[PDB]
Design a protein around this nucleic acid. Structure first.
Ligand SMILES: [K+]
Ligand SMILES: [K+]
Ligand SMILES: [K+]
Ligand SMILES: [K+]
Ligand SMILES: [K+]
Ligand SMILES: [K+]
Ligand SMILES: [K+]
Ligand SMILES: [K+]
Ligand SMILES: [K+]
Ligand SMILES: [K+]
Ligand SMILES: [K+]
Ligand SMILES: [K+]
Ligand SMILES: [K+]
Ligand SMILES: [K+]
Ligand SMILES: [Mg+2]
Ligand SMILES: [Mg+2]
Ligand SMILES: [Mg+2]
Ligand SMILES: [Mg+2]
Ligand SMILES: [Mg+2]
Ligand SMILES: [Mg+2]
Ligand SMILES: [Mg+2]
Ligand SMILES: [Mg+2]
Ligand SMILES: [Mg+2]
Ligand SMILES: [Mg+2]
Ligand SMILES: [Mg+2]
Ligand SMILES: [Mg+2]
Ligand SMILES: [Mg+2]
Ligand SMILES: [Mg+2]
Ligand SMILES: [Mg+2]
Ligand SMILES: [Mg+2]
Ligand SMILES: [Mg+2]
Ligand SMILES: [Mg+2]
Ligand SMILES: [Mg+2]
Ligand SMILES: [Mg+2]
Ligand SMILES: [Mg+2]
Ligand SMILES: [Mg+2]
Ligand SMILES: [Mg+2]
Ligand SMILES: [Mg+2]
Ligand SMILES: [Mg+2]
Ligand SMILES: [Mg+2]
Ligand SMILES: [Mg+2]
Ligand SMILES: [Mg+2]
Ligand SMILES: [Mg+2]
Ligand SMILES: [Mg+2]
Ligand SMILES: [Mg+2]
Ligand SMILES: [Mg+2]
Ligand SMILES: [Mg+2]
Ligand SMILES: [Mg+2]
Ligand SMILES: [Mg+2]
Ligand SMILES: [Mg+2]
Ligand SMILES: [Mg+2]
Ligand SMILES: [Mg+2]
Ligand SMILES: [Mg+2]
Ligand SMILES: [Mg+2]
Ligand SMILES: [Mg+2]
Ligand SMILES: [Mg+2]
Ligand SMILES: [Mg+2]
Ligand SMILES: [Mg+2]
Ligand SMILES: [Mg+2]
Ligand SMILES: [Mg+2]
Ligand SMILES: [Mg+2]
Ligand SMILES: [Mg+2]
Ligand SMILES: [Mg+2]
Ligand SMILES: [Mg+2]
Ligand SMILES: [Mg+2]
Ligand SMILES: [Mg+2]
Ligand SMILES: [Mg+2]
Ligand SMILES: [Mg+2]
Ligand SMILES: [Mg+2]
Ligand SMILES: [Mg+2]
Ligand SMILES: [Mg+2]
Ligand SMILES: [Mg+2]
Ligand SMILES: [Mg+2]
Ligand SMILES: [Mg+2]
Ligand SMILES: [Mg+2]
Ligand SMILES: [Mg+2]
Ligand SMILES: [Zn+2]
Lengths: 129, 25, 150, 141, 98
RNA sequence: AGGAUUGGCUCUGAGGGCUGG
RNA sequence: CCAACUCAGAACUGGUACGGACAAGGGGAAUCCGACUGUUUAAUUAAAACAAAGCAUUGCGAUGGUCCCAACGGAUGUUU
RNA sequence: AUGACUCUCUUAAGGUAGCCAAAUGCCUCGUCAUCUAAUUAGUGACGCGCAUGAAUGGAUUAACGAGAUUCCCACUGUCCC
RNA sequence: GUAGGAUAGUGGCCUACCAUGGUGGUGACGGGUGACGGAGAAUUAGGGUUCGAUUCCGGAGAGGGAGCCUGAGAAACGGCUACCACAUCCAAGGAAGGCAGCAGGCGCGCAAAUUACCCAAUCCUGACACGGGGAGGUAGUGACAAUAAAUAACAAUACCGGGAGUCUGGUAAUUGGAAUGAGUACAAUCUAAAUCCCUUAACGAGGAUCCAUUGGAGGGCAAGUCUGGUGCCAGCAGCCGCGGUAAUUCCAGCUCCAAUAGCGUAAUUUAAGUUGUUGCAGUUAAAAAGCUCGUAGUUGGACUUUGUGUUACUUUGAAGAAAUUAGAGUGCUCAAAGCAAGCCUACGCUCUGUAUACAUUAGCAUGGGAUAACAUUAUAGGAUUUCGGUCCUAUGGGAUCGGAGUAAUGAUUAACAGGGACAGUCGGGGGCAUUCGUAUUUCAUAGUCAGAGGUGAAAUUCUUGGAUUUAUGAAAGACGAACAACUGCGAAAGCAUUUGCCAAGGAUGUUUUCAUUAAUCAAGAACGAAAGUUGGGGGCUCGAAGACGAUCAGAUACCGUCCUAGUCUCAACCAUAAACGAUGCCGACCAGGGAUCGGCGGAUGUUGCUAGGACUCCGCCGGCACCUUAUGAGAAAUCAAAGUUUUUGGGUUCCGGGGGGAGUAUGGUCGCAAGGCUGAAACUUAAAGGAAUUGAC
């Protein structure tokens, strides 16, 4: 059964991006997916995405711009304190110069760079670069 | 030796042990 | 897919985006609830009460007109059956198989299906006990199951 | 595939515990059968030379490997110890105290010598290497 | 090494197929695996049609045909040359020959 | 198979029936 | 208010005696034979012998199988 | 040393599965082991078995026995006497 | 649990009485440990693996038990008592014994030092400034381990190169003068006293014999196709291999290589992504349970503020031994270290320094509330003011029972999740009963007459007593041809003649209903071809075993003939197959194409037909498959999944760790048995194996 809606959303985008598609539909939609997309959008990894209301869970259509190499979830959602962010980046990111790990913290969903600035820990949702 | 017949040989050998051990209980 | 098979069917109803009643539907909510109570007293269940309204009264969805589901309306009037409808039908099927199986001891296919039906009864009964729709001590007994249904 | 649940800590730990036994190296040390070996977990051991024997070299080689049956003093077990170097068997006499060591493969046979896993290091308290190089002589005669 | 995608037979979505007996040696072989040939020929060989027709006791008469369905096992089909060993590329061709 | 207990005397506790609103 | 006798425990006590007479299994490790209970040479043999349940074979559909009878008839047979 | 194997005479068929110095072995107090200070006894093995062997039933077998047998513990006037 | 007893005191610590509880797949109980625990140690990109007897902390013991005195403190052992085990002395009547304190001895072993000096330092103890201290220190032994660092430097000749010439560089047991500690020794210093070090008079180097060793020189792997010897011998060789008369590998010489006062050989870390949480495998290499159900476990759609219910998580802080680790300062000559020192030249100074970080998990305390878990909800025992009654109680409060108000009064949505209902269908799905079919065998009747059968060829076998063959009829038992397919149904096994009955089911359709009820599953369950087992029935055909005829050197086989069990059925067992797609299940995503099966929607004009069926065209959902293709994957074969994997993580179960030994031994469990399930070790071995290529056959 559907266990992680975030995994389906990111897996669909990653497959579509490699195939060279311009648009991709994500179903079901969730506020976790939307916030994850916003983090990618702010860093210029996706274009404009639109949420469609179907009275059940909604759907999202995401415009791709070809800048996204890979995006995936980390399951299970391990706890990550501020001191342990450095270890995770050395494992999941191509280098120490680009790529973001998305964390869910008490202050909201944000990338690891923002988490260090606010000095807040949390759990890993995924990554992209 | 064909595996089927080697299996048959071992099963025969187990009967003799079974009968040779129950001879003294 | 299916709980107790390899089927992967997706056929189902597709509710419209418009939750409000059609402009051509003139029956008011009090009238609809009166009919629902009237049908319930005749022995009909929530599943087949809605079918009559859709096919004979033009009421596609009771919630659109009344704002509440059929079962909720019956409960407010004290007409909800003690055993939920879906659990009731599973018990009836199990009784039918057992009655057939007593005369057919070599029908191993029926014996296989009886296990599936009864296991489905226990899973559903467990859920209702947690939600307090059944008595806390309620238990399904093959010996006395036939007395409950029918 | 692998169990991934955040609450699956017990299953992963218990699964690995069972599967480590499938590893031959792990099972050899944790079985406890090492103490039943003639050395009983020791690097060396002293023994008494029972007789001087020769063992046919395994094929495709052809030779007579000079060995010596030795009874270990500490437990009385009899083993075959290879005598290395050329003409060193002449330095070994029956009913003599010899220090024995492993053959280098941790209880496994070495080279073309069949079923031999020990070698002689000392004879009568003198290393065979010293005798071979004429550094020392056996204490007798 | 797997030689054929079909495994040498024609069975999909079913467990068991009852066997038939080879027309040549009587060997048991699943029906979907046996090589089947339906032979239709005149009951009288072409070398004797002229003689039989001349001796016909009726002004008009059509010689009946002999219908025989032959089911061979793999060994008999190869030995009898009903089928031949083909190259790796030609094994996939399923259309009957000319 | 194997082991322990057993007398006398003076006591203690437990196990009931029928009547009475 | 009236009750019968089963069980359990404690103290004290005698020269450690006390199922005080009477009554009343010795026990264990194996082999042979017969499965067992039963029966047998009254008056020298009680057994490993006979019988036994179980197993198998044979005959017979009544104008019959087995058997008795001098003859006539009869037993199995109130049977199948 | 033994004889899987081969040769040869030959039967209606040449004792198979099992079992054994057996209540069945002459030789014989057979050979080995075990039990004993010492055992023609007992038990376990071995088998070219004078002369074992399959409802003339073969091989086993819990329970049973006023059935035959060997040993050990208890017990003792059986004995030392 | 109650009441006592005992104890410094709590407590089944113990007694009496009473109750029937307590623990357990979240592993109790029991077993193993060559198991004292921790601080820590080794190795470590990260995670991790292994070790931790030993100087700091805690515990425990004093040959094995037990008991006890004294005392603030002991179940003390350099205190006592007894037993047991060892053992000393004796005038044989007795008496005295405890080194796992220091040294030493024996024994055990692969394995470990002086029967030395001293209380001077550190500190402890007593009546005590003073005594004592095998604690502790000092020296001896000490290649456990660790640090620094000699065994030559320079110049001129001869010889040999580089940039005819001339500057630079390299060799020589040549020739020269210089330097110096190993050693030795006045002395001083060192020390409790000695000794060593440090310092230093004299002495102390040319083959500076003041002599560097340990392993190698075929490959891995730095270094010889040198010379003599040996001749598949002797030996080497961790692995691959070398040696059979011309050995790069053995035994030697020479030369060369590596490390170097060190080096070789005989548990554990690394290598090992060959234990994989990070991070491995299971189509064919080792590895998906035959199939489905199912509890615990593990994992679970979306939705609630954006612009005193209980927890996990995260942030910060407090607490937290030292030593070790990291690390700041500091020129012990450097260094391993140490915790010292530095400053100036007075009767001294820098308050000199002796930082700081790290420290799982659990616990304590603040801030945050996204994600996530549990709990909760509709006859509100609801929230909210207000007005009473009653009861209890202080210098009003509390409890309880009511009235009248206030308010938007109080229920998220219906997953291309799941369950259930309904509708018309579909299917070789299952059970029961029943209909039919030709063939085979047998018999009867009738007909005919010498062969028939079988084989590569023959023979066993049958036959004028009529075989084989032909027609008709009957019985018996089995089987269900053709149709029949890269088609259908079923969880799998499996399912195929007709019709009836019984219950069940997928898919499709649905503006029906419930509303997370789900996915996968230890334990535990249902089904499970064939063969087999017990008994009854049946017994055509076929047919293990058996017998015989052939073939053959032999033929216990293949071929032929006869035939027992069996083959069919019922009742009861067995639970195993290449039970295969050699591929577990659920979910998402990622190419194209036609055909086909079931259902439905739309379009259309034909039917020797009764809106519909059959056919034609378009499309949707579901199913068995196939074809092309790589942008993918793979060792490849190949796969549209075996793809979306070092750019590694959707959930979950089972399962593999070189080849054998071995699915064997043993124990347990199931079975009447056959056997099933569970399941080793000793030992052995350098390959076995997968895919593909060229040859040869
Ligand atoms: K449906
Ligand atoms: K692990
Ligand atoms: K075929
Ligand atoms: K009796
Ligand atoms: K008669
Ligand atoms: K008797
Ligand atoms: K107390
Ligand atoms: K108490
Ligand atoms: K005191
Ligand atoms: K002192
Ligand atoms: K003092
Ligand atoms: K990694
Ligand atoms: K079963
Ligand atoms: K289709
Ligand atoms: Mg689906
Ligand atoms: Mg399921
Ligand atoms: Mg996965
Ligand atoms: Mg092949
Ligand atoms: Mg199917
Ligand atoms: Mg099959
Ligand atoms: Mg016997
Ligand atoms: Mg008897
Ligand atoms: Mg009598
Ligand atoms: Mg008599
Ligand atoms: Mg008598
Ligand atoms: Mg019998
Ligand atoms: Mg008469
Ligand atoms: Mg015999
Ligand atoms: Mg005999
Ligand atoms: Mg004797
Ligand atoms: Mg005697
Ligand atoms: Mg005997
Ligand atoms: Mg005889
Ligand atoms: Mg016979
Ligand atoms: Mg006889
Ligand atoms: Mg017998
Ligand atoms: Mg018996
Ligand atoms: Mg009797
Ligand atoms: Mg108390
Ligand atoms: Mg008590
Ligand atoms: Mg330890
Ligand atoms: Mg210990
Ligand atoms: Mg320790
Ligand atoms: Mg120890
Ligand atoms: Mg020590
Ligand atoms: Mg200590
Ligand atoms: Mg103590
Ligand atoms: Mg001692
Ligand atoms: Mg003591
Ligand atoms: Mg002492
Ligand atoms: Mg002491
Ligand atoms: Mg040492
Ligand atoms: Mg020197
Ligand atoms: Mg010096
Ligand atoms: Mg050399
Ligand atoms: Mg080299
Ligand atoms: Mg040479
Ligand atoms: Mg070499
Ligand atoms: Mg390995
Ligand atoms: Mg591997
Ligand atoms: Mg294979
Ligand atoms: Mg395999
Ligand atoms: Mg959720
Ligand atoms: Mg839905
Ligand atoms: Mg048919
Ligand atoms: Mg069909
Ligand atoms: Mg199971
Ligand atoms: Mg079966
Ligand atoms: Mg299997
Ligand atoms: Mg399999
Ligand atoms: Mg499964
Ligand atoms: Mg499978
Ligand atoms: Mg269609
Ligand atoms: Mg393809
Ligand atoms: Mg991975
Ligand atoms: Mg292996
Ligand atoms: Zn054939």
């Amino acid at each position: 059964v559907r266990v992680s809606v975030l995994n389906d959303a990111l897996k669909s985008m990653y497959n579509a991006e490699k195939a060279g598609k311009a648009q991709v539909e994500l179903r079901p939609s969730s506020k976790v997916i939307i916030k994850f997309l916003i983090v990618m959008q702010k860093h210029g990894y996706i274009g404009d995405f639109q949420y469609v209301d179907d009275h059940r869970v909604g759907k999202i259509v995401v415009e791709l711009n070809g800048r996204l190499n890979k995006c995936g979830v980390i399951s299970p959602r391990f706890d990550v304190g501020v001191a342990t962010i450095e270890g995770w980046t050395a494992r999941l990111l191509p280098s120490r110069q680009f790529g973001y790990i998305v964390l869910t913290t008490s202050a909201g969903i944000m990338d690891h760079e923002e988490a260090r600035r606010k000095n807040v820990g949390g759990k890993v949702l995924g990554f992209f670069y | 030796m064909r595996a089927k017949w080697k299996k048959k040989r071992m099963r025969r050998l187990k009967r003799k042990r079974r009968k040779m051990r129950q001879r003294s209980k | 897919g299916r709980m107790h098979s390899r089927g992967k069917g997706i056929s189902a109803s597709a509710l419209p985006y418009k939750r409000t009643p059609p402009s051509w539907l003139k029956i008011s909510a009090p009238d609809v609830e009166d009919n629902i109570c009237k049908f319930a007293k005749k022995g009909l269940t929530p599943s087949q009460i809605g079918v009559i309204l859709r096919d004979s009264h033009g009421i596609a969805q009771v919630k659109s007109v009344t704002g509440s589901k059929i079962l909720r309306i019956l409960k407010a009037h004290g007409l909800a059956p003690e055993i939920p409808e879906d659990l009731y039908h599973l018990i009836k099927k199990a009784v039918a198989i057992r009655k057939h199986l007593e005369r057919n001891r070599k029908d191993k296919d029926s014996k296989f299906r009886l296990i599936l039906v009864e296991s489905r009864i226990h899973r559903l009964a467990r859920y209702y006990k947690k939600t307090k729709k059944l008595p806390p001590v309620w238990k399904y007994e093959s010996t006395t199951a036939s007395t409950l249904v029918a | 595939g692998k169990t991934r649940g955040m609450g699956a800590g017990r299953k992963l730990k218990s699964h690995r515990r069972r599967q480590r036994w499938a590893d031959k190296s792990y099972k050899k040390s944790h079985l406890g059968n090492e103490w039943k070996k003639p050395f009983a977990g020791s690097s060396h051991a002293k023994g008494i030379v029972l007789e001087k024997i020769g063992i046919e070299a395994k094929q495709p080689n052809s030779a007579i490997r000079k060995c010596a049956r030795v009874q270990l003093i500490k437990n009385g077990k009899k083993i075959a110890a290879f005598v290395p170097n050329d003409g060193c068997l002449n330095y070994i006499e029956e009913n003599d105290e010899v220090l024995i060591a492993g053959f280098g493969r941790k209880g496994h046979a070495v080279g073309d010598i069949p079923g031999v896993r020990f070698k002689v290091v000392k004879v009568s308290g003198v290393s065979l290497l010293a005798l071979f190089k004429e550094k020392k002589e056996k204490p007798r005669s | 090494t797997f030689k054929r995608r079909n495994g040498g037979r024609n069975k999909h979505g079913r467990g068991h197929v009852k066997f038939i007996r080879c027309s040549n040696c009587g060997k048991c072989c699943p029906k979907d695996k046996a090589i089947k040939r339906f032979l239709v020929r005149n009951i009288v060989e072409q070398a004797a049609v002229r003689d039989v027709q001349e001796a016909c006791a009726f002004e008009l008469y059509t010689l009946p045909k002999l219908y025989l369905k032959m089911q061979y096992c793999v060994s008999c089909a190869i030995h009898s040359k009903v089928v031949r060993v083909r190259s790796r590329t030609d094994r996939r061709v399923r259309e009957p020959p000319q």
